[PDB]
């Protein structure tokens, strides 16, 4: 059962579409995966270790997609658009996992640190590119890169997830990407 | 005891500096306010009704401060700076209440709706001013005002509270205001 592990993971993702993690139990994941509950414990310490793995696969997948863009070099607006779209698509394709993993930041120290580690990495990378662009004479030296990048990344976290969750207020899903790209391009190039 | 009510409210604010709401009990608020626990229930249904009132006073105070600016009319960068500073100062002066009321959005429907109501109001107001400025020929017609205003407000929510809570990553408290003002001015006036 690496089969059975993937089965447990797919079952968690499906059930998370319909209800929160506190509304799902181990017996539910077990049943769904076609195995007994003690068999479940061979794979995962708990429900929450399931969410953590689901979350970790989605963030790593966003992160790899971001590496892929990085290694293969278009106008500046589009470059930023393609980077942001990595997150809109990756998380937009896994809304139940995104939403539930963001809620679990409050109550799980491993979820909080997983998210926190990848944010620092995403911010460091955004700043490196901002700085690169300043090195080339294409963007002006205004805010420190690393502070500008931190506010931009935290914006996208809040706005993407608000859109995906249908929160009031939020930008409509169909408008969210253009909205973010406009703010990134004007703040990075203006000033 | 409107005295006793204010005493209960001050005691909650002080204890929230040192620990979370789940670490505070009614007997703690009672004791702190110099009254018995059944006397506490005359004032508040629960601990959480206390947080809700504390939160509601801070948001209304931010909101009034924002009305005050509105009724008395300086350059555009500074106008935005003064608006954002209302939030940085108001919430910055009540960090324990801010932080705990943001955590309570997850688990309390009244806290969620209080926050949600004032966000719609803050966004509607930001858009009205963006649109005004477009009417005068001072800002270009780029994004729809109301979508640009929504992403900007959600940015400030996430970034201010991350700074106040010392989160990793976050912008340093001493840099957060300039960081936000730069992004607001370039995105509203650029493109
Ligand atoms: C072309 C480039 N894009 C990025 C880039 C980095 C991070 C983000 S993000 O803000 O949207 N990711 C962090 C917030 C999240 F993950 F919640 F979306 C967008 C583009 C770096 S270089
Ligand atoms: C000069 C003007 N400023 C505003 C203004 C409205 C809202 C905000 S906010 O984004 O910082 N408030 C909402 C987010 C919060 F409350 F969490 F800070 C800042 C300025 C409207 S007109």
UniProtKB/Swiss-Prot annotation, chains A, B:
**A Gene Ontology BP annotation from the UniProt entry:** regulation of DNA-templated transcription
Q: Which residues bind DNA?
A: 25-44
Knocked-out gene: effects: Cells lacking this gene leads to ETH hypersentivity.
Pfam families referenced in this protein's UniProt entry, alphabetically:
EthR_C, TetR_N
Q: Which GO terms describe its cellular component?
A: cytosol
Coiled-coil features, chain-numbered ranges: none
Free-text activity regulation comment from the record: Inhibited by tert-butyl 4-(3-thiophen-2-yl-1,2,4-oxadiazol-5-yl) piperidine-1-carboxylate (RF1) and 1-(thiophen-2-ylacetyl)-4-(3-thiophen-2-yl-1,2,4-oxadiazol-5-yl)piperidine (RF3).
Q: Where is this site: Inhibitor-binding?
A: 153, 156
Name the InterPro entries for this protein.
Answer: EthR_C (IPR049397), Homeodomain-like_sf (IPR009057), HTH-type_TetR-like_transc_reg (IPR050109), HTH_TetR (IPR001647), Tet_transcr_reg_TetR-rel_C_sf (IPR036271)
Q: Which domain of life is it from?
A: Bacteria
List the Gene Ontology MF annotations in alphabetical order: DNA-binding transcription factor activity; transcription cis-regulatory region binding
- Domain HTH tetR-type, by residue range, is 2-62
Disulfide cysteine pairs (residue numbers): none
- Indicate whether Transcription regulation appears among the record's keywords: yes
Per UniProt, the keywords (alphabetical) are: DNA-binding, Repressor, Transcription, Transcription regulation
Function of the protein: Involved in the repression of the monooxygenase EthA which is responsible of the formation of the active metabolite of ethionamide (ETH).
Q: What else is known?
A: Binding of inhibitors to EthR induces a conformational change in this repressor, which is then unable to bind its DNA operator, consequently allowing for increased transcription of EthA and bioactivation of ethionamide (ETH).
Provide the assembly information.
Answer: Homodimer.
Q: Which PANTHER family match?
A: HTH-TYPE TRANSCRIPTIONAL REGULATOR ETHR, HTH-TYPE TRANSCRIPTIONAL REGULATOR RUTR
Q: What is this protein called?
A: HTH-type transcriptional regulator EthR
Q: Which gene encodes it?
A: ethR
